[PDB]
């Protein structure tokens, strides 16, 4: 298959959050069939970022998902042509983010072009005050609608102090060619910043994801 057991990653993200505009570039590697990937991220414009890096990281590719043989792999089937996605992120305090990604491959390496945009984040909330610690692990409900794959997941940021900051993800996954469509299933996620420098200009990011029926 064109998706090899080990695939490299390259990405570029341009965006703006509450007016502050930025550019982040990424280099990485992962095992698509194990559902594990690691990314080395770099802020190229807009350092230091005035908002919590956590809101960006799920925007930094469901091809890195361990899929059982009995579930069609919508994402691995889309290649080499690739796929794109569109995501809305509705936070509980009316903060709101919109993101898109265009994913292709070349050789042993994925490429992403990411756009990220957010606004109406309260000036004293956790995102603008950088009071987030991590994303809790989550479960995304995948299901086919309008000939394309859709995913919904309830997300929550653990805050400094112990409380939680909840967000609603709704994503549309559009393959660039015809692929065998699966029925409803779930993807378990865990995303983690392994290491970072003081202002998060250098960040190392890890995700593990596996698909399964309910």
């Amino acid at each position, epitope marked *: 298959s064109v998706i090899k057991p080990e695939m490299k990653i390259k990405l570029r993200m*341009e965006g703006a959050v509450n007016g502050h505009k930025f550019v982040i570039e990424g280099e990485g590697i992962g095992k698509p069939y194990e559902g594990t990937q690691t990314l080395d991220l770099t802020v190229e414009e807009g350092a230091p970022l005035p908002f919590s890096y956590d809101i960006l990281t799920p925007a930094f590719n469901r091809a890195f998902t361990k899929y059982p043989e009995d579930i069609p792999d919508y994402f691995k089937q889309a290649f*080499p042509e690739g796929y794109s996605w569109e995501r809305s992120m509705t936070y509980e305090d009316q903060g709101i983010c919109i993101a898109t990604s265009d994913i292709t491959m*070349e*050789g042993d390496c994925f*490429f992403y072009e990411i756009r990220f945009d957010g606004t109406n984040f309260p000036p004293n909330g956790p995102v603008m005050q950088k009071k987030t610690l991590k994303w809790e692990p989550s479960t995304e409900k995948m299901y086919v609608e309008d000939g394309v794959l859709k995913g919904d997941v309830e997300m929550a940021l653990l805050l400094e102090g112990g409380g939680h900051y909840r967000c609603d993800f709704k994503t549309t996954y559009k393959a660039k060619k015809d692929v065998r469509l699966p029925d409803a299933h779930e993807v378990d996620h865990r995303i983690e910043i392994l290491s970072h420098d003081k202002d998060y200009n250098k960040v190392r990011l890890y995700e593990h994801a596996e698909a399964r029926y309910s």
Partner: nanobody
Amino acid sequence: SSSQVQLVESGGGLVQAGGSLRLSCAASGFPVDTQWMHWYRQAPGKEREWVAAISSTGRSTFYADSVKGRFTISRDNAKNTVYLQMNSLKPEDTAVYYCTVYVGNRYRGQGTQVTVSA
């Protein structure tokens, strides 16, 4: 197949170290703004080296770490052409340069030669 997509490179030649050179990759058979496109180079004897890449929308550009800062990839959608601007050339940049694209199948140019003198 050559009546489906064609990539035609040009702009190569010989130049002295520290010089400049601007390659062109003229596309035919598909709109250049609908596909990611890459530049490869291949010295004789050694393996091919991925040089640079540009996205469908042209808002993203990627370069190998061996030519960053010096090489620039750009695009003109009206002329349907991808360009590779090469500054501060070094004798190790000596290879045949070609562009490549995937539109249902893999297409590749014939390549233009760049030879850098010491």
